[PDB]
Design a protein around this nucleic acid. Sequence first.
RNA 1: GAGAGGA
DNA 2: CGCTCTGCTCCTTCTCCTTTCCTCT
DNA 3: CAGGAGAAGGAGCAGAGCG
Lengths: 83, 215, 49, 49, 146, 48
Amino acid sequence: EKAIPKDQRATTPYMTKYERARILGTRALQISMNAPVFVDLEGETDPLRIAMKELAEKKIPLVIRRYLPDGSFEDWSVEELIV
Amino acid sequence: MDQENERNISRLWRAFRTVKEMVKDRGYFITQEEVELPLEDFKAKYCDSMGRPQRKMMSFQANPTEESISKFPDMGSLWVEFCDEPSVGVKTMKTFVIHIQEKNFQTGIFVYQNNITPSAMKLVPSIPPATIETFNEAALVVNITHHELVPKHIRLSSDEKRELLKRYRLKESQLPRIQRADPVALYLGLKRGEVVKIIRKSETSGRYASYRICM
Amino acid sequence: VAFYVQDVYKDNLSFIQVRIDLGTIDKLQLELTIEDIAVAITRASKLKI
Amino acid sequence: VKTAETGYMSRRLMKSLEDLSCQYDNTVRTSANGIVQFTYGGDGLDPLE
Amino acid sequence: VRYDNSGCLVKREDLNKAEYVDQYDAERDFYHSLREYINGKATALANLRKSRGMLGLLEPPAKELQGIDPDETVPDNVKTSVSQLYRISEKSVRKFLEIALFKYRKARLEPGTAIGAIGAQSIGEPGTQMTLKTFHFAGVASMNVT
Amino acid sequence: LPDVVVKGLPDISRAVINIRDDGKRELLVEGYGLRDVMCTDGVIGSRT
RNA sequence: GAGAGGA
DNA sequence: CGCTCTGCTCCTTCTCCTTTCCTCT
DNA sequence: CAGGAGAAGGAGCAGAGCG
């Protein structure tokens, strides 16, 4: 039920394609709602491209709650996840 | 006549070997030389003067081994008896269950010959402490566990089941159940709620373990 | 393995006669006798009356 | 004559296995959290890669 | 480590007892296959070496001559021939192992995959292309099959 | 009377001996008597 | 509503 | 020792399904 | 308009016990 502490977390340290797509979608939804960005914009306007560029530099400020079937859940930061 | 009697003798010998190995791999004490009994020995020690299958002598009692009684504290001796009358009815089954009760046996295996009256089946599952099981002689000719398509089953104790449930964080109602009266389940005689671990072999994946429970 | 079947009456009774030809039994090396055929008929008379 | 039968078979086959997911404990499970496989295919390897 | 069903550790004498198999068996088999493949390559190199004078050093040499070159007495001409025929480098072996391990850790069913839908489609869609072809039971024309 | 199954299994249409490769042979049966086929002598029950 | 392409 | 329930097992006669839709007319 | 597969009642016997 409680969050599994960071010291031991069985869930894979990798970033699944579903998690990557969901992170990009959430970050693009936030940016489309006039949210600050943490990358050099370079003139891009479509929020999805800005989200992709942020994920390229690991600048997306989100974490993943991987819900195990029992009920517990490991919180994995996007920065720590590998691609 | 001669051919029918000899065929029945050979079939009974194969059935007796199957029964011996079934009571062996459950954890009881038999010797490999006892199960590996040549047909000549079966004729010599389990037949009358004129050579007919008499079942009153081949019935036996088996007791657990030290390791199996350590793994399973609650496992008493069992009494394997055959029958003389083909159409087993209420009377013979009642005599057998009375004998089981008076002999202080935890379980008994009744290998009926040809047919079981449904009244006997009704009387079968009425014993609180002990239990009895029915095996057709035709159903025991080649043991199921030695077929090519039957993977290795293992009976898991309470401690092993608890370890498995804690490891996978599951419950007793989520594992892939195996029905009671399943031919590889009643072979091991799994009681309701006992986990069996299956060493399943596939050509693309080697061996791996899959777990089931008896329901 | 019947090789013929006949129905024969008598003065006050009737019956069915079938003579199993042992030649075909030997040539087919089947492991059965007259008693085996008779007991098979009696046991499979479930379909019959 | 085969198209309709194949379509129906595919429909019902999908209706059976509609909700099976590889959970984060590496066990294929159904919607009701009833574990059908303890590891996908015995190795947990996706055939796509 | 292959913990037993009771939670204890196998005593190194019954690891392959066929009653203690569990998950991570596929990974051990894959590692054994990798080791077997590298052993086959090294054995091929050693068998080439022993065919041209140089002793095949598949088994590790003793420490009584570990610090010295084990083939200095051999003429340098055959050394070049063996090198140009079969040469296995440290970088090549490390790169092969890294690539194999990366492609293995990549080739795992990622959690959350809708594996049920994938399986149902993979079993149903080929049915849409299974045109009825008449077959028999492996050379027996009479024994018709479906 | 001339249709009662005298010998065999009354659930089998036919049985044909087939010759496998490398000289082996086995019997292919059209019917539903698997348990009886495994039980009857002359065959190996572990592979049927 | 039901007649027929169509892929 | 036939007689009389139960119970089982056939046997017959019943019910619910048959891609995708994509148009026009 | 065909094909497939179950659920529900008659119906004909074994089986058990009996006064």
